[PDB]
Structure 1
Amino acid sequence: GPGSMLIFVKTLTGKTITLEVEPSDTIENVKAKIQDKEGIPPDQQRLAFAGKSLEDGRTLSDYNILKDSKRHPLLRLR
């Protein structure tokens, strides 16, 4: 909630969406947020950051992706 961070997600259609995520959110939770906003079922979603796959069970922080509030990662669906 209060300490959430902005991320971007590029979908297969070329649309980029934003999400607010907790440093602690799991990848599954990120996929649920993408479903909730954009309608893509989690079973279709495979997320990557900078060419590396994001595993179910990890947070973005488990990948050292979230920085300060100045820099916002772009995740990509593949």
Structure 2
Amino acid sequence: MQIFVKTLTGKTITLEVEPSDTIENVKAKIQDKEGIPPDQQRLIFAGKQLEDGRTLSDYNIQKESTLHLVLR
């Protein structure tokens, strides 16, 4: 499935993922695409910071959902 990742700078990322992908997996895909190391990434969806061990489906992240990426 496809999701979008918005940043502060405002450039949005299109990612292809799976429902069973962990948040850690998604950060790894972001590193692959954008070169941002996972340990600098905060992913947020529906008001909450997403935990590495949990899946996209755990947070009910679906086809064409948008996540927010904040750099720390």
TM norm structure 1: 0.83
Structure with larger Rg: 1
**What are the ranges of 5 or more consecutive residues in structure 2 without an aligned counterpart?**
none
- Provide Cα deviations, 1:14-51, integer angstroms capped at 9, x if missing partner: 11010000110000000000010011111110000122
- State yes or no: 1:12 paired with 2:4: no
Q: Runs of at least 4 residues of structure 1 off by over 2 A?
A: none
Specify the alignment match of 2:31 in structure 1: 35
Report the Cα distance in structure 1 between the residues aligned to 2:28 and 2:50, rounded to whole angstroms.
14
**What are the ranges of 5 or more consecutive residues in structure 1 without an aligned counterpart?**
none
Kindly tell me the number of residue pairs found equivalent between the two proteins. 70
Alpha-carbon contact 2:19-2:57 (below 8 Å) kept: yes
Specify the alignment match of 1:77 in structure 2: 69
Report the Cα distance in structure 1 between the residues aligned to 2:66 and 2:10, rounded to whole angstroms.
13
Alpha-carbon contact 2:44-2:67 (below 8 Å) kept: yes
Residue 65 of structure 1 deviates from its aligned partner by 1.7
Residue number among 45, 48, 60 corresponding to 2:41 in the alignment? 45
Report the Cα distance in structure 2 between the residues aligned to 1:18 and 1:73, rounded to whole angstroms.
10
TM norm structure 2: 0.90
